[PDB]
Amino acid sequence: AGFIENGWEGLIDGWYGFRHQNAQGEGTAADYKSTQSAIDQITGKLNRLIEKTNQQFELIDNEFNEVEKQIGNVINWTRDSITEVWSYNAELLVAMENQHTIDLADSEMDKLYERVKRQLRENAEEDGTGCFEIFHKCDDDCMASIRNNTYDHSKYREEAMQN
Amino acid sequence: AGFIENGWEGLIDGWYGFRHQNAQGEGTAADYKSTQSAIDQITGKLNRLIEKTNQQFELIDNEFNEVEKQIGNVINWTRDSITEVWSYNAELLVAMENQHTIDLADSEMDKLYERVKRQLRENAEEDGTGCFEIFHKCDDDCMASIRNNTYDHSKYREEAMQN
Amino acid sequence: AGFIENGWEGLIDGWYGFRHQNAQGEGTAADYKSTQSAIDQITGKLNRLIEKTNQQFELIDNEFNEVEKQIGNVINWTRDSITEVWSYNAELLVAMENQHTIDLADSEMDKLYERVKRQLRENAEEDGTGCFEIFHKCDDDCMASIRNNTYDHSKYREEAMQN
Amino acid sequence: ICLGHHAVSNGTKVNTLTERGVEVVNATETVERTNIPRICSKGKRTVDLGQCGLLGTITGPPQCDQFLEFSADLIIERREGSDVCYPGKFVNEEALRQILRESGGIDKEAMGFTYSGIRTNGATSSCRRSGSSFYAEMKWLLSNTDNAAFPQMTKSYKNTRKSPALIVWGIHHSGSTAEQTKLYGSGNKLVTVGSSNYQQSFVPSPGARTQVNGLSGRIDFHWLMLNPNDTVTFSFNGAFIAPDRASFLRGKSMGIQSGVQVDANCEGDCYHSGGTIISNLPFQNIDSRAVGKCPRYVKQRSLLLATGMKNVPE
Amino acid sequence: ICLGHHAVSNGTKVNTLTERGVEVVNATETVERTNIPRICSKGKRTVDLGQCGLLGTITGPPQCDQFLEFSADLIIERREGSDVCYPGKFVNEEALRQILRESGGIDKEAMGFTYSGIRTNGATSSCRRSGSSFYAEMKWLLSNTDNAAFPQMTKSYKNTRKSPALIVWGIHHSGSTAEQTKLYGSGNKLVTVGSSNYQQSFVPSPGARTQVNGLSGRIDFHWLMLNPNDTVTFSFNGAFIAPDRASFLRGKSMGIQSGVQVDANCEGDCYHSGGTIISNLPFQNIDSRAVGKCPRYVKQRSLLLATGMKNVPE
Amino acid sequence: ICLGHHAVSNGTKVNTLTERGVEVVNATETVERTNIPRICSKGKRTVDLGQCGLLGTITGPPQCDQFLEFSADLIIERREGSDVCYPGKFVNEEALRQILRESGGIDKEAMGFTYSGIRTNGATSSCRRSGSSFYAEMKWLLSNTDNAAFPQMTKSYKNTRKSPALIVWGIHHSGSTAEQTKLYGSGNKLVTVGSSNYQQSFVPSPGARTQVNGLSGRIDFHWLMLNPNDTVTFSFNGAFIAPDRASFLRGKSMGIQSGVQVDANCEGDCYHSGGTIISNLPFQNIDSRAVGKCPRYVKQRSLLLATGMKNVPE
Ligand SMILES: *[C@@H]1O[C@H](CO)[C@@H](O)[C@H](O)[C@H]1NC(C)=O
Ligand SMILES: *[C@@H]1O[C@H](CO)[C@@H](O)[C@H](O)[C@H]1NC(C)=O
Ligand SMILES: *[C@@H]1O[C@H](CO)[C@@H](O)[C@H](O)[C@H]1NC(C)=O
Ligand SMILES: *[C@@H]1O[C@H](CO)[C@@H](O)[C@H](O)[C@H]1NC(C)=O
Ligand SMILES: *[C@@H]1O[C@H](CO)[C@@H](O)[C@H](O)[C@H]1NC(C)=O
Ligand SMILES: *[C@@H]1O[C@H](CO)[C@@H](O)[C@H](O)[C@H]1NC(C)=O
Ligand SMILES: *[C@@H]1O[C@H](CO)[C@@H](O)[C@H](O)[C@H]1NC(C)=O
Ligand SMILES: *[C@@H]1O[C@H](CO)[C@@H](O)[C@H](O)[C@H]1NC(C)=O
Ligand SMILES: *[C@@H]1O[C@H](CO)[C@@H](O)[C@H](O)[C@H]1NC(C)=O
């Protein structure tokens, strides 16, 4: 989400995808692998945080008949201290998990971009805004081979090389 | 801060910058965008940590007339436990925040380097030590266009390509 | 550990290394720098976590002659609360440290790959699976110069360039 | 061919380590706030004490007649409950309450106390049953006639079980010295209770108190836990409410204080006075004094966890 | 054209998860250590008790004559303060102290106790005012002449307000039995105090103690919180320090123990015995028993937070 | 030329923030579970009380005769230890125990109490030495002959040191009123103890108790800490166990309860009833009530820390 200026509101099929415009027409598709990886890691993070505590705490005060004032002030003091501890732990936990989540999604996008660059060696150039400027008409079946990770790195080499 | 051997002590205008030497002369400038982003994130981290607690804790012991020894030992025991908890939380908090800060600055530098490589496609090469070996005399106004992110990727293409 | 399909079980000399096959024969070697950096950071993490607490806690209960039931239930209540706090802190600590460790190793591998690409500018290509497809017979002494970071970027330039 | 990510029109603002208000795609809640205003007791043996007080289940006032040998996994106290019919007070109230909340119920058994030359059926107007009665588990020890003396008696009981027993006796503080002499006789009275862990020292104190239920006298209940095979002894010369039956804890249970209804249609392990907290979230902002297996209470009303990528719209 | 980052000659060493001593550019402190040796009470109603003890404000020794109806947001106790003029001691000291620290002040009102046939003005040398006086809020109940008897009296007071009242009475323990008979008369004395939540049982104990202020007698002060519309009752036959006026809590306040000066030029919400902690940092290493709205105390003297990039000099 | 990383055949599964069971190369343990079933006391002055109870070291029963002036850095209590020879009980037991555990030992010194007209050597069968003896640090104060009266005496002691003193006296509760009159005389008995911080009020209570060691009487031990230069006073007319010598704390020590053997071959700073925890790990799962310098107890049995890269085999 850096050098890519903004996200695609029309992309409702997944989290990441390809938007191609050649000589045949326009199209948008979703990359199942990176999206499923991201939602798998975030889903596992949720499942790790959505934990049920198996520790039982009994009643230590009394709402109907107040306990003695000294031991009651000690109980309230300890309970307030623990409350501060858990408020801090919750704040820091949520903040850190959100940071690692956002940077995780950015890492997934960056790795998808890097591998798409790994497929197209010298047959295409980079523009700087997350696009791959092609120098050989790539047919819709050729771009479908790009999405399927089956693009031959050398059967379009010289053609897109002399341009 | 990896393959870049060391920092520039003379760079007093910002955190990141360009040091160019062509055919016209020498010069150093600062990149306002990446530096302002880094100091914005670190500044926001400070503002997130420099928080004032709105929870009031009352006096539970007595310095002039010591309370009973049993309840006093319980109070000291609980207070020492909470003290250990907050010492641990402070140590871990500072350590993690420092780690994420350093790696954040390294990420900002790496992204600046990556985008400067995104501007210069085939008109220049990479040396390995954070420099861009140019193969066309680039004028001082051309390097000023590099810093302003206005370098035309194709109006110097063949000239720096046949070298 | 991403676009590299799997690890090398035969690599028993270090954590990262080079496996080269040219015209002379086969071979595997270990990169001392990246491995020593990784084990230095992880070792320092262990030394930071393997800390001895200098805080002494005295006996507050009594196993042979049970204390009064009210103050005993308060003591058990506080001790159980602190136990929950330290269980949570231990779980989160171990999880976060493991995450940062794995991503740290992945970062070291990625930086080694990136610097090996920094050595070989236009004299070789990238395949996409963590290999460097050479286009000039590189002798075993040439690959030993690659591992020693002494490969001349231009004395094999045109030869591997016209291929 | 270009690459990109998905976005939405209206995102969800979350907080991170660096900024506060970063708009992402999807985010879930981690702090529970929804509360069910009922006591979810599905699949649990539940005893709603109602007008009966917890401690009363050991002494047995009229309102506790149907709770003398209860058994439950969850015990519910009500603010209208009362431990006493005759005006009085327990010593170490909350200790015995906390003991009885996790007892799993009580099991009474006659201690076998026979008396010779002493009237044993003392009653009062405030302990109404068919007429004037007393605690169903206690014996108000008085003199034979409207006066005469009280013999300095001693009675012992050996815990013949494998679990500790709950021993509860009473010390009657009359409305005046003349009434103490009328019920037991003149002279200083003493009640001694002894065992291996207990060793205590009672003496009545007659006087005038506020008219609770139209009465000025008081009765102070005391208790001790008797270890197996160990004997408890009493040496008293008057002003004594003797125990008829001893109590034995059945097992484990849960004790809560609430004012909402019981509902066997929902199940929950986190209770407070306003209901049940049924949630999988790790935190809650309902009641700090919630008991059971609860999410840990925090002060924040909400803490949004980012479940999606950062939202960057056009 | 080359790219690079900034550096400095002398960096700041910080600690991370991987190493200890990583030199970075800039770093700030997170553990507070600077302490102001004053009580910053700017904009707060402050009462410096000084030589007056906190509990004394309810009984009223001479040194507390100007604190009988104080009102404050911050209460400061001094180690030279004393609760008593006549040598004595409060029962449940720290409980009543903790109650009075957050009370926002006290509000006295005469309880309306009239006596018939009993001398009401007992004084002592240690409670000096114009001559020999006593507690300004208490009445030392004695016999009419140098002897005769003490009638077994009973007096009641109904809390006619909406907030609980603070009831404090006294039990005089004379220097000898002959002096107890000289002040009240022979025979066993009893003081009974009763209400809906209270039910207690006093009896004097004459004897010789250490000469504090040149005196061997003692006075034990007791207290209870009376709920609205509920009545407190006393049945006593001698050795009684009766309450003249009852106390009512004004609101909320803060109570600290300190030995430094009051300074209305600075504002602070974190106090300890050595002064005020005015800091925005999340942690502090001054006093673990600091009270108010304080940074959380840690054991580490310093914890440097990295605010800049790693420093790599040439 | 290709690049790659190392792997293994059988990795170690660890848990992270995203998944649970990620197989890595190497992983170490962070939760300690190995326990040494001994008391590692290498280089520490150790006192194994054995059959002697801790509190007994102040009163001095026979089994504590060799512990009257002990000195240690580590104190070990045994479940077979006993504080008393004559059947009795301390008031504020665990407070005095916690005081004596960190005292570094005790130092006795004769208080200098001389008596005139009162028999001072009272003994019992259960306190066996050469014949019938008593507490080595106490004096059972009785009447001259088998009856007569007990003069109302008063004795004082001034703490002439720089550290607080431990003052322990006794209140004898006889088996019957006739035995109390036989040992001290008829009439109400009182024992008054006074100082600057103490002010208390004892009175015996004769009666029958359970036959512990074949005896029905009891002795209640009481204590107070006397500040330097401050005087403690006693005014008693019978039923008094007087202190012979006062105790002074030596310094600092550690007190544990254990049932395992002492071993001077290993060193450890974390102790529990089952032994010593010698570990560098930050957490432990042995005993939650472990004392000393211990790893912090957690509920998890194991928590594997990843020390290597993720393991991806072919
Ligand atoms: C503890 O706090 C509660 C409020 O949650 C309050 O009702 C109670 O009175 C406090 N305890 C004491 C002893 O004041
Ligand atoms: C608690 O610790 C303080 C030192 O901060 C000490 O003065 C006090 O005596 C301790 N409490 C008891 C009951 O010993
Ligand atoms: C506290 O827990 C222990 C078990 O570790 C138990 O033996 C003890 O009885 C509990 N305390 C009370 C007062 O029940
Ligand atoms: C968004 O998060 C909520 C949290 O429970 C989840 O139920 C929902 O399915 C999520 N939606 C998407 C599109 O991820
Ligand atoms: C209890 O006493 C009986 C008979 O005196 C004996 O058979 C039994 O073993 C004893 N049990 C224990 C636990 O002491
Ligand atoms: C360094 O950090 C301190 C922390 O308060 C700040 O005041 C100062 O402005 C910072 N300086 C730079 C150059 O970042
Ligand atoms: C208190 O009593 C008065 C008169 O007896 C009555 O008017 C008032 O409603 C009562 N208030 C409460 C809270 O009981
Ligand atoms: C694996 O970790 C353990 C942890 O103590 C260590 O002793 C061992 O040397 C490590 N081995 C390798 C190959 O890293
Ligand atoms: C204790 O008293 C002695 C003599 O009365 C005196 O010399 C000494 O200074 C006093 N010490 C203290 C601490 O009061």
Concatenating the DSSP letter of every residue in E248-313 gives EE-S--EEEE--SEEETTSB-SEEETTEE----SSEE-S-TT-EES-PEE-S-S--EEE-SPBP--
CATH number at residue D242: 3.90.209.20
CA distance D56 to D170: 13
Is D42 known as a binding-site position? no
Among D17, D22, D303, the strongest candidate for a mutation testing the B interface, having the largest count of B CBs within 10 A, is: D17
Answer yes or no: do E112 and E254 share one domain.
Answer: yes
Query: In the 8-state DSSP scheme, what is residue A59?
Result: -
Residue B130, ligand 2, Cβ within 6 A: no
| Closest chain C CA to residue B124 | C121
Q: Closest-lying ligand to the alpha carbon of A66?
A: 1
**What is chain A's Cα-based Rg?**
27
- Helical H segments across chain F, by residue range: 56-59, 93-101, 177-183
CA distance E39 to B135: 71
F54 φ, ψ (degrees, to nearest 5): -60, -55
Helix-, strand-, coil-residue percentages of chain E, each rounded to 5: 10, 40, 55
- 8 Å CB contact of E201 and D206: no
CA distance D145 to F2: 110
Chain C residues whose CB is inside 8 A of the D55 CB are none
Nearest CA to A84 among D9, E59, B89?
B89
Alpha carbon dihedral D104, D109, D113, D118, in 10-degree steps, equals 80
Residue A48, ligand 1, Cβ within 6 A: no
Alpha carbon dihedral C113, C39, E16, D24, in 10-degree steps, equals 40
CA distance A102 to A96: 10
Atom 5, ligand 6: which residue's CA is nearest?
E28
Atom 6, ligand 8: which residue's CA is nearest?
F28
Q: Closest-lying ligand to the alpha carbon of D160?
A: 5
Query: In the 8-state DSSP scheme, what is residue F222?
Result: E
Q: Is D19 on the interface with C (CB under 8 A)?
A: no
Last residue of a domain, one of D236, D260, D284: D260
Chain C residues whose CB is inside 8 A of the F288 CB are 79, 83
Residues in chain A: 163
The answer to whether F28 touches F307, Cβ cutoff 8 Å, is yes
Amino acid letter for position F230: D
- Helical H segments across chain A, by residue range: 32-49, 69-119, 140-147, 157-161
Q: Which residues are bridge partners to F46 per DSSP?
A: F74
Nearest ligand 3 atom, CA C71? 13
The answer to whether F284 touches F271, Cβ cutoff 8 Å, is no
Residue F160, ligand 9, Cβ within 6 A: no
Chain F residues whose CB is inside 8 A of the A97 CB are 17
The answer to whether C132 touches C106, Cβ cutoff 8 Å, is no
How close is the nearest chain F Cα to the Cα of C159, in Å?
18
A52 by DSSP, 3-state: which? coil
How many Å lie between the centroid of ligand 3 and the Cα of residue B71? 17
Residue B63, ligand 2, Cβ within 6 A: no
Report the alpha-carbon angle D84-D89-D93, nearest 5: 105
CA distance D58 to D99: 12
Residue C75, CB-side half-sphere exposure with 13 Å CA sphere: 20
The answer to whether D136 touches D123, Cβ cutoff 8 Å, is no
Nearest CA to E22 among E304, E253, E297?
E304
- 8 Å CB contact of D210 and E196: yes
How close is the nearest chain D Cα to the Cα of A162, in Å?
20
Chain E residues whose CB is inside 8 A of the D89 CB are 199
CA distance A29 to A22: 14
Q: Which of F15, F255, F289 sits opposite C98 (nearest CB)?
A: F15
b/e string for E90-107 if b means 16 or more Cβ within 10 A? bebbbbbbbbbbbbbbbb
Among C58, C92, C149, C152, the strongest candidate for a mutation testing the B interface, having the largest count of B CBs within 10 A, is: C58
- CB-count burial class (<10 Å; 0-12, 13-18, 19+) for E77: buried
How many Å lie between the centroid of ligand 1 and the Cα of residue E280? 29
Specify the pairing of strand E231-236 against strand E153-158: antiparallel
Nearest CA to A140 among A25, A31, A30, A16?
A25
- List the beta strands (DSSP E) in chain B: 16-21, 26-30, 124-126, 132-134
Nearest CA to E75 among E45, E42, E32?
E45
E159 by DSSP, 3-state: which? coil
Atom 4, ligand 2: which residue's CA is nearest?
B76
Amino acid letter for position C102: I
Amino acid letter for position E87: P
Amino acid letter for position E271: Y
Specify the pairing of strand F88-90 against strand F240-243: unpaired
Atom 14, ligand 4: which residue's CA is nearest?
D26
Q: Give chain C's largest Cα–Cα span.
A: 91
Q: Closest-lying ligand to the alpha carbon of D27?
A: 4
CA distance B3 to C32: 17
Nearest CA to F299 among F286, F308, F289, F311?
F286
CA distance C153 to C159: 12
Residue F187, ligand 9, Cβ within 6 A: no
The answer to whether E42 touches E264, Cβ cutoff 8 Å, is yes
CA distance F207 to F240: 17
Residues in chain F: 314
Residue F199, ligand 9, Cβ within 6 A: no
How close is the nearest chain E Cα to the Cα of D164, in Å?
30
Fold of B1-163: Hemagglutinin Ectodomain; Chain B (3.90.20)
Chain F residues whose CB is inside 8 A of the D203 CB are 205
Query: In the 8-state DSSP scheme, what is residue B52?
Result: P
The answer to whether D204 touches E190, Cβ cutoff 8 Å, is no
| Chain A (106-145) residues lying within 8 Å, Cβ to Cβ, of chain B | 125-128
Chain C residues whose CB is inside 8 A of the D95 CB are 68-70, 73
CA distance D292 to D276: 10
Atom 10, ligand 5: which residue's CA is nearest?
D229
- How many domains does chain F fold into? 2
Amino acid letter for position E178: A
How many Å lie between the centroid of ligand 4 and the Cα of residue D26? 6
Last residue of a domain, one of F260, F285, F303: F260
F210 φ, ψ (degrees, to nearest 5): -65, 145
Chain E residues whose CB is inside 8 A of the A84 CB are 296
Crossing angle of helices D93-101 and C69-119, in 10° steps, is: 60
Q: Closest-lying ligand to the alpha carbon of E227?
A: 7
The answer to whether D270 touches D280, Cβ cutoff 8 Å, is no
3-state secondary structure chain D: CEEEEECCCCCEEEECCCCEEEEECCEEECEECCCECEEEECCCCEEECCCECCCHHHHCCHHHHHHCCCCCCEEEECCCCECCCCCEEECCHHHHHHHHHCCCCEEEEECCCCCCCCCCCCCEEEEECCCEECCCCEEEECCCCCCCCCCCEEEEEECCCCCCEEEEEEEEECCCHHHHHHHCCCCCCCEEEECCCCEEEECCCCCCCCCCCCCCCEEEEEEEEECCCCEEEEEECCCEEEECEEEEECCCCEEEECCCEEECCCECCEEECCEECCCCCCEECCCCCCEECCCEECCCCCCEEECCCECCCC
CA distance D130 to D147: 27
Crossing angle of helices B69-119 and C69-119, in 10° steps, is: 20
Answer yes or no: do F253 and F290 share one domain.
Answer: no
Q: Closest-lying ligand to the alpha carbon of E27?
A: 6
Nearest CA to F14 among F27, F32, F33?
F27
F16 by DSSP, 3-state: which? coil
CA distance A105 to F175: 82
Domain that holds residue D130: 45-260
Among E14, E16, E17, the strongest candidate for a mutation testing the C interface, having the largest count of C CBs within 10 A, is: E17
D188 φ, ψ (degrees, to nearest 5): -70, 130
How many Å lie between the centroid of ligand 5 and the Cα of residue D230? 10
Among C94, C118, C120, C149, the strongest candidate for a mutation testing the F interface, having the largest count of F CBs within 10 A, is: C94
CA distance C40 to C49: 14
In sequence order, what are the residues at sequence separation of 6 or more whose Cβ sits closer than 8 angstroms to the Cβ of residue E259? E78, E79, E273, E274
CA distance C70 to C68: 6
F142 φ, ψ (degrees, to nearest 5): -125, 180
CA distance D254 to A67: 19
Answer yes or no: do F211 and F267 share one domain.
Answer: no
| Chain C (56-115) residues lying within 8 Å, Cβ to Cβ, of chain A | 70-71, 73-74, 77-78, 80-81, 83-85, 88-89, 92, 95-96, 99
CATH number at residue F288: 2.10.77.10
CA distance A67 to C117: 73
C153 by DSSP, 3-state: which? coil
Nearest CA to B33 among B149, B161, B137?
B149
User: Computed from CA positions of residues D33, D38, D40, D42, in that sequence, does the dihedral angle turn out positive or negative?
Assistant: negative
Answer yes or no: do F252 and F277 share one domain.
Answer: no
Q: Which of C20, C87, C98 sits opposite F306 (nearest CB)?
A: C98
A84 by DSSP, 3-state: which? helix
E24 φ, ψ (degrees, to nearest 5): -115, 180
In sequence order, what are the residues at sequence separation of 6 or more whose Cβ sits closer than 8 angstroms to the Cβ of residue F175? F206, F207, F208, F209, F215, F216, F217
- The domain ranges of chain B are 1-163
Nearest CA to F275 among F265, F264, F287, F284?
F287
CA distance F79 to F257: 8
- 8 Å CB contact of A118 and C126: yes
How many Å lie between the centroid of ligand 9 and the Cα of residue F72? 30
* Cβ neighbours around B56 below 10 Å, total: 15
Report the neighbours of E using a cutoff of 3 or more CB pairs below 8 angstroms.
A, B, C, D, F
In sequence order, what are the residues at sequence separation of 6 or more whose Cβ sits closer than 8 angstroms to the Cβ of residue C136? C123, C156, C159, C160, C163
Nearest CA to A47 among A55, A39, A58, A36?
A39
The answer to whether F232 touches F193, Cβ cutoff 8 Å, is yes
Last residue of a domain, one of D233, D260, D287: D260
Atom 2, ligand 5: which residue's CA is nearest?
D229
Q: Which of B44, B55, B100 sits opposite D19 (nearest CB)?
A: B44
- Distances in Å between the Cα of B133 and the Cα atoms of B24, B136, B138, E8 are 16, 9, 11, 27
Nearest CA to D298 among C150, A88, E176?
A88
